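@here heads up, posting the sequence + SMILES for the magnesium ion run so it's all in one place. Ping me if the SMILES looks off, I pulled it from an old spreadsheet.
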Amino acid sequence: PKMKTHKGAKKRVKITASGKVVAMKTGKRHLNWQKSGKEIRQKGRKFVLAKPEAERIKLLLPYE
Amino acid sequence: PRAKTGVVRRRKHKKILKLAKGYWGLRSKSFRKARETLFAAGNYAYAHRKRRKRDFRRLWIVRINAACRQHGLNYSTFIHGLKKAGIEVDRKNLADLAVREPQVFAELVERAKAAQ
Amino acid sequence: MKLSDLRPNPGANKRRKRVGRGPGSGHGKTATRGHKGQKSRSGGLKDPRRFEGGRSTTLMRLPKRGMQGQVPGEIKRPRYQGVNLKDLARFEGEVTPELLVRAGLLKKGYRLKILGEGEAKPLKVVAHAFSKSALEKLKAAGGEPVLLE
Amino acid sequence: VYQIPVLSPSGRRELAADLPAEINPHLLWEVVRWQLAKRRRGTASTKTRGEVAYSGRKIWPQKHTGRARHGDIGAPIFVGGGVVFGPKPRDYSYTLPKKVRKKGLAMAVADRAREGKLLLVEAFAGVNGKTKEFLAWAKEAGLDGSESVLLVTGNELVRRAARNLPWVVTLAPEGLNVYDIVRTERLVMDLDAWEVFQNRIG
RNA sequence: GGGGGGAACCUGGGGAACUGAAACAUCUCAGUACCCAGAGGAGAGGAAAGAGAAAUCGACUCCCUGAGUAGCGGCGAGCGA
RNA sequence: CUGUUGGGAAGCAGCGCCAGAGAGGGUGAAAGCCCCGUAGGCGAAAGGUGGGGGGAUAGGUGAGGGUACCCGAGUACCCCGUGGUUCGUGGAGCCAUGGGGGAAUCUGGGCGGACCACCGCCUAAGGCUAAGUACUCCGGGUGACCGAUAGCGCACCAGUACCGUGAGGGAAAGGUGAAAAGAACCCCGGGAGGGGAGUGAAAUAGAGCCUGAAACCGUGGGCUUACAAGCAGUCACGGCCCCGAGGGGUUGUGGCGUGCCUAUUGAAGCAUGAGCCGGCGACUCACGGUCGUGGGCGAGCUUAAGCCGUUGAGGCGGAGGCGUAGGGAAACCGAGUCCGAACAGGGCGCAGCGGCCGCAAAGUCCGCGGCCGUGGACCCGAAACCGGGC
RNA sequence: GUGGAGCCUGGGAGUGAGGGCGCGAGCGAUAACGUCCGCGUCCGAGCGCGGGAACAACCGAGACCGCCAGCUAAGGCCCCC
RNA sequence: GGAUGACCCCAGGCGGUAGGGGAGCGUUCCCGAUGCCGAUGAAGGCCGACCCGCGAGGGCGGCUGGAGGUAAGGGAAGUGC
RNA sequence: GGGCCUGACUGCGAGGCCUGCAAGCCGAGCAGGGGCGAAAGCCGGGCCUAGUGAACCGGUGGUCCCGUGUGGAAGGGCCAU
Ligand SMILES: [Mg+2]
Ligand SMILES: [Mg+2]
Ligand SMILES: [Mg+2]
Ligand SMILES: [Mg+2]
Ligand SMILES: [Mg+2]
Ligand SMILES: [Mg+2]
Ligand SMILES: [Mg+2]
Ligand SMILES: [Mg+2]
Ligand SMILES: [Mg+2]
Ligand SMILES: [Mg+2]
Ligand SMILES: [Mg+2]
Ligand SMILES: [Mg+2]
Ligand SMILES: [Mg+2]
Ligand SMILES: [Mg+2]
Ligand SMILES: [Mg+2]
Ligand SMILES: [Mg+2]
Ligand SMILES: [Mg+2]
Ligand SMILES: [Mg+2]
Ligand SMILES: [Mg+2]
Ligand SMILES: [Mg+2]
Ligand SMILES: [Mg+2]
Ligand SMILES: [Mg+2]
Ligand SMILES: [Mg+2]
Ligand SMILES: [Mg+2]
Ligand SMILES: [Mg+2]
Ligand SMILES: [Mg+2]
Ligand SMILES: [Mg+2]
Ligand SMILES: [Mg+2]
Ligand SMILES: [Mg+2]
Ligand SMILES: [Mg+2]
Ligand SMILES: [Mg+2]
Ligand SMILES: [Mg+2]
Ligand SMILES: [Mg+2]
Ligand SMILES: [Mg+2]
Ligand SMILES: [Mg+2]
Ligand SMILES: [Mg+2]
Ligand SMILES: [Mg+2]
Ligand SMILES: [Mg+2]
Ligand SMILES: [Mg+2]
Ligand SMILES: [Mg+2]
Ligand SMILES: [Mg+2]
Ligand SMILES: [Mg+2]
Ligand SMILES: [Mg+2]
Ligand SMILES: [Mg+2]
Ligand SMILES: [Mg+2]
Ligand SMILES: [Mg+2]
Ligand SMILES: [Mg+2]
Ligand SMILES: [Mg+2]
Ligand SMILES: [Mg+2]
Ligand SMILES: [Mg+2]
Ligand SMILES: [Mg+2]
Ligand SMILES: [Mg+2]
Ligand SMILES: [Mg+2]
Ligand SMILES: [Mg+2]
Ligand SMILES: [Mg+2]
Ligand SMILES: [Mg+2]
Ligand SMILES: [Mg+2]
Ligand SMILES: [Mg+2]
Ligand SMILES: [Mg+2]
Ligand SMILES: [Mg+2]
Ligand SMILES: [Mg+2]
Ligand SMILES: [Mg+2]
Ligand SMILES: [Mg+2]
Ligand SMILES: [Mg+2]
Ligand SMILES: [Mg+2]
Ligand SMILES: [Mg+2]
Ligand SMILES: [Mg+2]
Ligand SMILES: [Mg+2]
Ligand SMILES: [Mg+2]
Ligand SMILES: [Mg+2]
Ligand SMILES: [Mg+2]
Ligand SMILES: [Mg+2]
Ligand SMILES: [Mg+2]
Ligand SMILES: [Mg+2]
Ligand SMILES: [Mg+2]
Ligand SMILES: [Mg+2]
Ligand SMILES: [Mg+2]
Ligand SMILES: [Mg+2]
Ligand SMILES: [Mg+2]
Ligand SMILES: [Mg+2]
Ligand SMILES: [Mg+2]
Ligand SMILES: [Mg+2]
Ligand SMILES: [Mg+2]
Ligand SMILES: [Mg+2]
Ligand SMILES: [Mg+2]
Ligand SMILES: [Mg+2]
Ligand SMILES: [Mg+2]
Ligand SMILES: [Mg+2]
Ligand SMILES: [Mg+2]
Ligand SMILES: [Mg+2]
Ligand SMILES: [Mg+2]
Ligand SMILES: [Mg+2]
Ligand SMILES: [Mg+2]
Ligand SMILES: [Mg+2]
Ligand SMILES: [Mg+2]
Ligand SMILES: [Mg+2]
Ligand SMILES: [Mg+2]
Ligand SMILES: [Mg+2]
Ligand SMILES: [Mg+2]
Ligand SMILES: [Mg+2]
Ligand SMILES: [Mg+2]
Ligand SMILES: [Mg+2]
Ligand SMILES: [Mg+2]
Ligand SMILES: [Mg+2]
Ligand SMILES: [Mg+2]
Ligand SMILES: [Mg+2]
Ligand SMILES: [Mg+2]
Ligand SMILES: [Mg+2]
Ligand SMILES: [Mg+2]
Ligand SMILES: [Mg+2]
Ligand SMILES: [Mg+2]
Ligand SMILES: [Mg+2]
Ligand SMILES: [Mg+2]
Ligand SMILES: [Mg+2]
Ligand SMILES: [Mg+2]
Ligand SMILES: [Mg+2]
Ligand SMILES: [Mg+2]
Ligand SMILES: [Mg+2]
Ligand SMILES: [Mg+2]
Ligand SMILES: [Mg+2]
Ligand SMILES: [Mg+2]
Ligand SMILES: [Mg+2]
Ligand SMILES: [Mg+2]
Ligand SMILES: [Mg+2]
Ligand SMILES: [Mg+2]
Ligand SMILES: [Mg+2]
Ligand SMILES: [Mg+2]
Ligand SMILES: [Mg+2]
Ligand SMILES: [Mg+2]
Ligand SMILES: [Mg+2]
Ligand SMILES: [Mg+2]
Ligand SMILES: [Mg+2]
Ligand SMILES: [Mg+2]
Ligand SMILES: [Mg+2]
Ligand SMILES: [Mg+2]
Ligand SMILES: [Mg+2]
Ligand SMILES: [Mg+2]
Ligand SMILES: [Mg+2]
Ligand SMILES: [Mg+2]
Ligand SMILES: [Mg+2]
Ligand SMILES: [Mg+2]
Ligand SMILES: [Mg+2]
Ligand SMILES: [Mg+2]
Ligand SMILES: [Mg+2]
Ligand SMILES: [Mg+2]
Ligand SMILES: [Mg+2]
Ligand SMILES: [Mg+2]
Ligand SMILES: [Mg+2]
Ligand SMILES: [Mg+2]
Ligand SMILES: [Mg+2]
Ligand SMILES: [Mg+2]
Ligand SMILES: [Mg+2]
Ligand SMILES: [Mg+2]
Ligand SMILES: [Mg+2]
Ligand SMILES: [Mg+2]
Ligand SMILES: [Mg+2]
Ligand SMILES: [Mg+2]
Ligand SMILES: [Mg+2]
Ligand SMILES: [Mg+2]
Ligand SMILES: [Mg+2]
Ligand SMILES: [Mg+2]
Ligand SMILES: [Mg+2]
Ligand SMILES: [Mg+2]
Ligand SMILES: [Mg+2]
Ligand SMILES: [Mg+2]
Ligand SMILES: [Mg+2]
Ligand SMILES: [Mg+2]
Ligand SMILES: [Mg+2]
Ligand SMILES: [Mg+2]
Ligand SMILES: [Mg+2]
Ligand SMILES: [Mg+2]
Ligand SMILES: [Mg+2]
Ligand SMILES: [Mg+2]
Ligand SMILES: [Mg+2]
Ligand SMILES: [Mg+2]
Ligand SMILES: [Mg+2]
Ligand SMILES: [Mg+2]
Ligand SMILES: [Mg+2]
Ligand SMILES: [Mg+2]
Ligand SMILES: [Mg+2]
Ligand SMILES: [Mg+2]
Ligand SMILES: [Mg+2]
Ligand SMILES: [Mg+2]
Ligand SMILES: [Mg+2]
Ligand SMILES: [Mg+2]
Ligand SMILES: [Mg+2]
Ligand SMILES: [Mg+2]
Ligand SMILES: [Mg+2]
Ligand SMILES: [Mg+2]
Ligand SMILES: [Mg+2]
Ligand SMILES: [Mg+2]
Ligand SMILES: [Mg+2]
Ligand SMILES: [Mg+2]
Ligand SMILES: [Mg+2]
Ligand SMILES: [Mg+2]
Ligand SMILES: [Mg+2]
Ligand SMILES: [Mg+2]
Ligand SMILES: [Mg+2]
Ligand SMILES: [Mg+2]
Ligand SMILES: [Mg+2]
Ligand SMILES: [Mg+2]
Ligand SMILES: [Mg+2]
Ligand SMILES: [Mg+2]
Ligand SMILES: [Mg+2]
Ligand SMILES: [Mg+2]
Ligand SMILES: [Mg+2]
Ligand SMILES: [Mg+2]
Ligand SMILES: [Mg+2]
Ligand SMILES: [Mg+2]
Ligand SMILES: [Mg+2]
Ligand SMILES: [Mg+2]
Ligand SMILES: [Mg+2]
Ligand SMILES: [Mg+2]
Ligand SMILES: [Mg+2]
Ligand SMILES: [Mg+2]
Ligand SMILES: [Mg+2]
Ligand SMILES: [Mg+2]
Ligand SMILES: [Mg+2]
Ligand SMILES: [Mg+2]
Ligand SMILES: [Mg+2]
Ligand SMILES: [Mg+2]
Ligand SMILES: [Mg+2]
Ligand SMILES: [Mg+2]
Ligand SMILES: [Mg+2]
Ligand SMILES: [Mg+2]
Ligand SMILES: [Mg+2]
Ligand SMILES: [Mg+2]
Ligand SMILES: [Mg+2]
Ligand SMILES: [Mg+2]
Ligand SMILES: [Mg+2]
Ligand SMILES: [Mg+2]
Ligand SMILES: [Mg+2]
Ligand SMILES: [Mg+2]
Ligand SMILES: [Mg+2]
Ligand SMILES: [Mg+2]
Ligand SMILES: [Mg+2]
Ligand SMILES: [Mg+2]
Ligand SMILES: [Mg+2]
Ligand SMILES: [Mg+2]
Ligand SMILES: [Mg+2]
Ligand SMILES: [Mg+2]
Ligand SMILES: [Mg+2]
Ligand SMILES: [Mg+2]
Ligand SMILES: [Mg+2]
Ligand SMILES: [Mg+2]
Ligand SMILES: [Mg+2]
Ligand SMILES: [Mg+2]
Ligand SMILES: [Mg+2]
Ligand SMILES: [Mg+2]
Ligand SMILES: [Mg+2]
Ligand SMILES: [Mg+2]
Ligand SMILES: [Mg+2]
Ligand SMILES: [Mg+2]
Ligand SMILES: [Mg+2]
Ligand SMILES: [Mg+2]
Ligand SMILES: [Mg+2]
Ligand SMILES: [Mg+2]
Ligand SMILES: [Mg+2]
Ligand SMILES: [Mg+2]
Ligand SMILES: [Mg+2]
Ligand SMILES: [Mg+2]
Ligand SMILES: [Mg+2]
Ligand SMILES: [Mg+2]
Ligand SMILES: [Mg+2]
Ligand SMILES: [Mg+2]
Ligand SMILES: [Mg+2]
Ligand SMILES: [Mg+2]
Ligand SMILES: [Mg+2]
Ligand SMILES: [Mg+2]
Ligand SMILES: [Mg+2]
Ligand SMILES: [Mg+2]
Ligand SMILES: [Mg+2]
Ligand SMILES: [Mg+2]
Ligand SMILES: [Mg+2]
Ligand SMILES: [Mg+2]
Ligand SMILES: [Mg+2]
Ligand SMILES: [Mg+2]
Ligand SMILES: [Mg+2]
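bot reply: prediction finished. Complex structure tokens:
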């Protein structure tokens, strides 16, 4: 039967035009009071997942 | 479609069995034992065609040595003297000479003493 | 040219890999699976795209983001597809959404928006939207922007 | 582009047709492969350990019998048991690209054309449904039956007359297809036939 | 007039567990297996107190597609209009 | 039809003929023309069907104006407990309903995802309804389906023998020959069996019957062996025997030499497995994905279900899918966009060869191959768990 | 320095029980065919070959095939040899 | 070198378990085939010190067997113990 | 030790350290609005290396981005915690 889109990945991640995989930096969900502003700010960006980890996530998204 | 074993396996077994003609008991009679026997046989043959080259040369040497000592020297001396004289007749031949041609062997012995 | 002459080009029809058929093939006994363990078993491993041996997975440690939607689902709103000026080059006279669908440029169910990559051509282009630069290039090349609603 | 003999009451004229100059044997092979796969019945079947007639009882205990462990006698390791990965009902067909079939048709006719083996005819003399009638006409048309012929015409009366001849394959023009052209040595067509074929390769 | 039978198919009344979740309880398996009642050559459904945004369509059934979309989900495994 | 070889002609040879029939099966071997058929035609007094054609019957059919009589009740509706839906308590509507409460008759009511308004949609609480759909005990047709360990459990007197108190389990077992011409009669023997005779093209086709492998048992012959130390061979030489400057068989002496498989750091290993032989026996298929590859077309590529045709013929079908633009949670903007006060900085994006022609290419379709996902997913094996019965 | 070198993109793995030895340590008892690291090696996969009486990892040496030819390596040259 | 995988010449590599890759052999079935081989003997069996091939194998001969078999080139798998 | 102070900034961030991933670390410089200093300049906590916890679910403040025919509303997204 056809493959299913993994909804947890669909909800965390985006495949960019050239097929990199992009996600939010981890670590500002909470426990933030003593984090510097450099930290909070930088954790506010997206990052490009390491190739082996991205290639795996990509196969979970067969129809994006 | 179905492809049942058919004729194929009996034919491989006869091949092996036929190579095993001569072997003892099940070794010529049982495909399994024949095949074991053959693995061993092929490795020995390989090993032994290597050592036949050695087996003969050892023999030539025992013979040359006998023929040398009739003329008062040993194999090691005789071979060094040949070397120094520049004589390159090989041991297969030195041996045939020593038996079939004593006069020639004697002369080579002479050149060998003389060459040192 | 006769039936006995009909052949696939070299490489067009390759043989399959057959395992577990004897030593000479170099794929016998273990059938290229190595020795023992879960992956050698019939049924094999867990989904290697996700599973990581029991530790929290790479994917599941990344944060979710944005609106995921709620029952009763997607909210119906007009959707726009852009098609650039350069794609309009091939037409002469008029372009309308219907035409662009036919040519295979605009997908059905999307409203038309004209965009600015390329040069404008003095055509009457009818559409639901124009970018700033598309409007400019078109007005400048003497073409006629018509807005649908 | 090609020059094609046409038989007439007025005699052997010539007709100009643009058929591909290049024949692509791989593609011809691909069309024939598709044709022969899709006519397959796919009716080969076997039973699995689950589909076989025996019961699911474990035949003897797991341990302490001195015998090998088994479950039910349906398991494929038993004579009588199911078969592992045998054939099951199958559909061998697949949708070969339309343009390929088209290009394929055209190339096949083109290939016979380039050999002189394609012959167009206006009508069929006296053939009114009798084999000996077609046979006469054929002799006169240069078909002694030493070469196999794919006869394409909408004239039912002509197909009936020729069908029984071992060296003749008959077809309506809607049926023209590359396996039949490639199977036969000579191609013979009605103009009306030639007309539809030209519309199909358009 | 009923009663009883019929290989599958069908509707209705009841309805598991292994297993999967690399443990497990929600979840899955699955309204499946299976028991029961009933029908019939089919059964069910069917002529809008519908759909759901089109100023629209127009009973029901069944196939393709829409779509693994929308969503659902110890937002896990998965489930899925 | 004839000739010919042959037990037999349908083989080979000569000369013919049919074909809307050269599908296929038989006949002593290989047959268009010998038989059964095949193409094309024909056929029901009786019973069944009859969705097609015809006929009948039931039944159907108006417009203003007024009246406010009727328009499905323990129902709607609300609350509580649940189920159904993609919806697992969620912002949880809708449909259904076990408990409680409980209306109205169009100025009535239900619905459009809490709720409210507005704007629309629809008429609950009675019933029926062909067809298009599912299945295959049954009949027929057809296989890049099996061919007696296969294929149904059963080609055969099988759901049998047999096993089990019972539910229930559940086999093995096909083939003389063209024709029985199935061996009169004699001989040995109680018989069985054999030897002659006879039949047959053939009888080691003789019914314990086609072929008739291998393990296994024997008779006969060649070579060899009773002072010898062995994973059984191998290399060398010599003896003997055989077929005829060579080969084959055998093996006295000399040299060398730790079975196979499995599992292991490491096995000849005193670690697993195997008595031997034959046969069966384990990486597949569908659908999706990802790469590679052979082609087709290329800013485009491609059709699905179906419909027409065919009866091993293909065509139509553009609904839809992938691609042609990205960025952003989104509104939204767009070769940009997001963060930002920023025209700052940054993230993620954007930009063929030759001579208008050819050539290559995005991409996409089909084939092929590797690997992945979902399925039992390479085969065999539990102890267990659950349902219904005995 | 042109090598079964290196670097980049992608397809397919297997492995994730090692072991002996030399040198450097820890642990142990300046014990273990002990144990645990480091650098190297070999066996693993070279239970192919020569030497070491025999013997995976000590010495010699990396077996494409054939030869009744030659030179050497470690180790040997009284007989077994 | 010759132009192209025609074959000759010079040189170098060629131990191998897990495992990657390449090239082939054979089994059943389909197209090729209304053909071709076949009772002057099919398949299958038993021999062979012969021929070709590195090999898997393929030929050829004799005996058995008595009615089938199937090429060059391709296709598909219940394909090798 | 004292004076003035809140840079224990906001928007970013060249380039690196480390590293299987995910993390962790250092950071010149530009803009906004500041502190100290006459100025050069320094200040995006603390001489430094420990004082910590991914995701999911949820709370609170802000934003005013989505709001299931439409206007709101429910509920969510986003920034902060
Ligand atoms: Mg999730
Ligand atoms: Mg965070
Ligand atoms: Mg958290
Ligand atoms: Mg937060
Ligand atoms: Mg929060
Ligand atoms: Mg701090
Ligand atoms: Mg800070
Ligand atoms: Mg911020
Ligand atoms: Mg899609
Ligand atoms: Mg995309
Ligand atoms: Mg087999
Ligand atoms: Mg067989
Ligand atoms: Mg066999
Ligand atoms: Mg074999
Ligand atoms: Mg045989
Ligand atoms: Mg063989
Ligand atoms: Mg012997
Ligand atoms: Mg023997
Ligand atoms: Mg014996
Ligand atoms: Mg024997
Ligand atoms: Mg061998
Ligand atoms: Mg050798
Ligand atoms: Mg040796
Ligand atoms: Mg002396
Ligand atoms: Mg010397
Ligand atoms: Mg010398
Ligand atoms: Mg294939
Ligand atoms: Mg092999
Ligand atoms: Mg390989
Ligand atoms: Mg290997
Ligand atoms: Mg093995
Ligand atoms: Mg592998
Ligand atoms: Mg593998
Ligand atoms: Mg294994
Ligand atoms: Mg391993
Ligand atoms: Mg194993
Ligand atoms: Mg292991
Ligand atoms: Mg294991
Ligand atoms: Mg493994
Ligand atoms: Mg294994
Ligand atoms: Mg296993
Ligand atoms: Mg299993
Ligand atoms: Mg498993
Ligand atoms: Mg969404
Ligand atoms: Mg104009
Ligand atoms: Mg088929
Ligand atoms: Mg099939
Ligand atoms: Mg079966
Ligand atoms: Mg079957
Ligand atoms: Mg079973
Ligand atoms: Mg069963
Ligand atoms: Mg059963
Ligand atoms: Mg069963
Ligand atoms: Mg049964
Ligand atoms: Mg059972
Ligand atoms: Mg049972
Ligand atoms: Mg059971
Ligand atoms: Mg046991
Ligand atoms: Mg036992
Ligand atoms: Mg047993
Ligand atoms: Mg046993
Ligand atoms: Mg058992
Ligand atoms: Mg079993
Ligand atoms: Mg069992
Ligand atoms: Mg069974
Ligand atoms: Mg069976
Ligand atoms: Mg069976
Ligand atoms: Mg089986
Ligand atoms: Mg199986
Ligand atoms: Mg099985
Ligand atoms: Mg299968
Ligand atoms: Mg089917
Ligand atoms: Mg396939
Ligand atoms: Mg298909
Ligand atoms: Mg014909
Ligand atoms: Mg033909
Ligand atoms: Mg009843
Ligand atoms: Mg009844
Ligand atoms: Mg039910
Ligand atoms: Mg009831
Ligand atoms: Mg129920
Ligand atoms: Mg229960
Ligand atoms: Mg459970
Ligand atoms: Mg299960
Ligand atoms: Mg699973
Ligand atoms: Mg579990
Ligand atoms: Mg588990
Ligand atoms: Mg447990
Ligand atoms: Mg469970
Ligand atoms: Mg399951
Ligand atoms: Mg369920
Ligand atoms: Mg039920
Ligand atoms: Mg069932
Ligand atoms: Mg009943
Ligand atoms: Mg019906
Ligand atoms: Mg009905
Ligand atoms: Mg009904
Ligand atoms: Mg009504
Ligand atoms: Mg879509
Ligand atoms: Mg469900
Ligand atoms: Mg005669
Ligand atoms: Mg005759
Ligand atoms: Mg004749
Ligand atoms: Mg016919
Ligand atoms: Mg016939
Ligand atoms: Mg026939
Ligand atoms: Mg014939
Ligand atoms: Mg025949
Ligand atoms: Mg016949
Ligand atoms: Mg008829
Ligand atoms: Mg008839
Ligand atoms: Mg009125
Ligand atoms: Mg009233
Ligand atoms: Mg009403
Ligand atoms: Mg009532
Ligand atoms: Mg309720
Ligand atoms: Mg529910
Ligand atoms: Mg919720
Ligand atoms: Mg709800
Ligand atoms: Mg109620
Ligand atoms: Mg109202
Ligand atoms: Mg009201
Ligand atoms: Mg209601
Ligand atoms: Mg309501
Ligand atoms: Mg409402
Ligand atoms: Mg509504
Ligand atoms: Mg409505
Ligand atoms: Mg009803
Ligand atoms: Mg009707
Ligand atoms: Mg129906
Ligand atoms: Mg049917
Ligand atoms: Mg039937
Ligand atoms: Mg067969
Ligand atoms: Mg057959
Ligand atoms: Mg049998
Ligand atoms: Mg059977
Ligand atoms: Mg048999
Ligand atoms: Mg039967
Ligand atoms: Mg059976
Ligand atoms: Mg049977
Ligand atoms: Mg019986
Ligand atoms: Mg009992
Ligand atoms: Mg009984
Ligand atoms: Mg039982
Ligand atoms: Mg049995
Ligand atoms: Mg018979
Ligand atoms: Mg008979
Ligand atoms: Mg006969
Ligand atoms: Mg008597
Ligand atoms: Mg008698
Ligand atoms: Mg007698
Ligand atoms: Mg007698
Ligand atoms: Mg006679
Ligand atoms: Mg004869
Ligand atoms: Mg015989
Ligand atoms: Mg016989
Ligand atoms: Mg017998
Ligand atoms: Mg016979
Ligand atoms: Mg017999
Ligand atoms: Mg016999
Ligand atoms: Mg015998
Ligand atoms: Mg004897
Ligand atoms: Mg003695
Ligand atoms: Mg003696
Ligand atoms: Mg010896
Ligand atoms: Mg000697
Ligand atoms: Mg001899
Ligand atoms: Mg000898
Ligand atoms: Mg040794
Ligand atoms: Mg030994
Ligand atoms: Mg050893
Ligand atoms: Mg072996
Ligand atoms: Mg073993
Ligand atoms: Mg073990
Ligand atoms: Mg062990
Ligand atoms: Mg051990
Ligand atoms: Mg031993
Ligand atoms: Mg032993
Ligand atoms: Mg033991
Ligand atoms: Mg042992
Ligand atoms: Mg063990
Ligand atoms: Mg036993
Ligand atoms: Mg034996
Ligand atoms: Mg066997
Ligand atoms: Mg595979
Ligand atoms: Mg693929
Ligand atoms: Mg492809
Ligand atoms: Mg194409
Ligand atoms: Mg798609
Ligand atoms: Mg930018
Ligand atoms: Mg091109
Ligand atoms: Mg392409
Ligand atoms: Mg993969
Ligand atoms: Mg399954
Ligand atoms: Mg499987
Ligand atoms: Mg698999
Ligand atoms: Mg099992
Ligand atoms: Mg028990
Ligand atoms: Mg339990
Ligand atoms: Mg229990
Ligand atoms: Mg029970
Ligand atoms: Mg019970
Ligand atoms: Mg290079
Ligand atoms: Mg290398
Ligand atoms: Mg390397
Ligand atoms: Mg691979
Ligand atoms: Mg691995
Ligand atoms: Mg491993
Ligand atoms: Mg481990
Ligand atoms: Mg380890
Ligand atoms: Mg270990
Ligand atoms: Mg190591
Ligand atoms: Mg270690
Ligand atoms: Mg040692
Ligand atoms: Mg060490
Ligand atoms: Mg030292
Ligand atoms: Mg040390
Ligand atoms: Mg240390
Ligand atoms: Mg001491
Ligand atoms: Mg140690
Ligand atoms: Mg030590
Ligand atoms: Mg130590
Ligand atoms: Mg080491
Ligand atoms: Mg190992
Ligand atoms: Mg070594
Ligand atoms: Mg090494
Ligand atoms: Mg070795
Ligand atoms: Mg050694
Ligand atoms: Mg030694
Ligand atoms: Mg020694
Ligand atoms: Mg060694
Ligand atoms: Mg080497
Ligand atoms: Mg020397
Ligand atoms: Mg030395
Ligand atoms: Mg010594
Ligand atoms: Mg190698
Ligand atoms: Mg290669
Ligand atoms: Mg390969
Ligand atoms: Mg070949
Ligand atoms: Mg084979
Ligand atoms: Mg092959
Ligand atoms: Mg077949
Ligand atoms: Mg045929
Ligand atoms: Mg034939
Ligand atoms: Mg002939
Ligand atoms: Mg004859
Ligand atoms: Mg003969
Ligand atoms: Mg054959
Ligand atoms: Mg055959
Ligand atoms: Mg042979
Ligand atoms: Mg023969
Ligand atoms: Mg026949
Ligand atoms: Mg064939
Ligand atoms: Mg062939
Ligand atoms: Mg072909
Ligand atoms: Mg198999
Ligand atoms: Mg101040
Ligand atoms: Mg950086
Ligand atoms: Mg990093
Ligand atoms: Mg300042
Ligand atoms: Mg400043
Ligand atoms: Mg100042
Ligand atoms: Mg700074
Ligand atoms: Mg401090
Ligand atoms: Mg500190
Ligand atoms: Mg920290
Ligand atoms: Mg969770
Ligand atoms: Mg968790
Ligand atoms: Mg949240
Ligand atoms: Mg609203
Ligand atoms: Mg708003
Ligand atoms: Mg609403
Ligand atoms: Mg308002
Ligand atoms: Mg608004
Ligand atoms: Mg308000
Ligand atoms: Mg709000
Ligand atoms: Mg909010
Ligand atoms: Mg935030």
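MO: The interface with chain C takes residues 23, 25-26, 28-30, 32-33, 108, 111, 182-183, 185 of chain D (CB under 8 Å).
MO: One more: Helices of chain D lie at 25-38, 98-114, 131-141, 156-162, 178-183, 191-200.
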